[PDB]
Each structure stands twice: as C-alpha cells, then as structure tokens.
Amino acid sequence: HSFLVDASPSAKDHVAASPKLVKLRFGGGVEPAYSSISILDSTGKLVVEGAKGQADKPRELTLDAPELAVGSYVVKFRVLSSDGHIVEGKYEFTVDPHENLY
Ligand SMILES: [Cl-]
Ligand SMILES: [Cu+2]
C-alpha cells in the first residue's frame, strides 16, 4: 500500500490564495493513469477530478486546480499502488481571503 505521506496543501491548512495545484506524495509508487484526486467544495460538489505524474517520481501525483473561491475544500484521493493495492483517503483545507471580497 502506498499511503499518503505528504500533501500540499495538507490537512487543516489555511492558504492565503487559491492553490495552483494539489501535490500528493505517497510511501510507495502509484500508477497515475489509474489514480484519482478530486476537490470537493464545502457543499460536497465536485470542483475538479484528475491526476498526473512523472515517470521518474513514481511516488507523487499532482492535480491542477481551477481558481478556488474563498472557503473550505476537501481533497479526496483513490490511488492504485504499484504493489497492486488500492488506497483511499481525504483531507480538508481552507482558502482564506487575502483582500476584501465583493
Ligand atoms: Cl517507490
Ligand atoms: Cu499494499
């Protein structure tokens, strides 16, 4: 099992602006073409799903995010580990305002 070992943003982080991407790092290889990352908004609506990786960094995945409105989000993931085992997980982060919102 390739468990999550690091993330950006990570669980319970507040970020000052919308993240350009979500970056996940696992404890073993994952297969990007058979892995999924999703961002959910604070109502649980699907904002974006996907996953990309680079062959020389088998333990990492990224997801390009659209511009995220201020508020809380959940990142969920469901990855296929290189040892053949599926891993799911999820965590929350918050986009704080960095200026007044109109
Ligand atoms: Cl590895
Ligand atoms: Cu395993």
The sign of the dihedral angle between the CA atoms of 92, 13, 59, 5 is negative
| 38, 59, 77, 81, 95 from 52: Cα distances, Å | 12, 11, 12, 14, 23
Among 42, 65, 43, CA closest to 52: 65
Q: Are 76 and 4 in contact (CB under 8 A)?
A: no
User: What is the 3 state secondary structure string of 12-32?
Assistant: CCEECCCCCEEEEEECCCECH
Starting from the CA of residue 81, give the closest ligand. 2
Query: What's phi and psi for 38, nearest 5 deg?
Result: -130, 145
The residues whose Cβ lies within 5 A of ligand 2, an ion, are 1, 83, 85
The residues whose Cβ lies within 5 A of ligand 1, an ion, are 28-29
Domains of the chain: 1-102 (2.60.40.1220)
Which neighbouring-strand residues pair with 71?
Answer: 95
The Cβ of residue 45 has, within 10 Å, a number of other Cβ atoms equal to 8
Which amino acid belongs to residue 101?
Answer: L
Give me the resolution in angstroms, 1 decimal.
Answer: 1.5
Tokens (6 digits) for 87: 């891993």
Starting from the CA of residue 83, give the closest ligand. 2
By CB neighbour count within 10 A (0-12 exposed, 13-18 middle, 19+ buried), where does 4 fall? buried
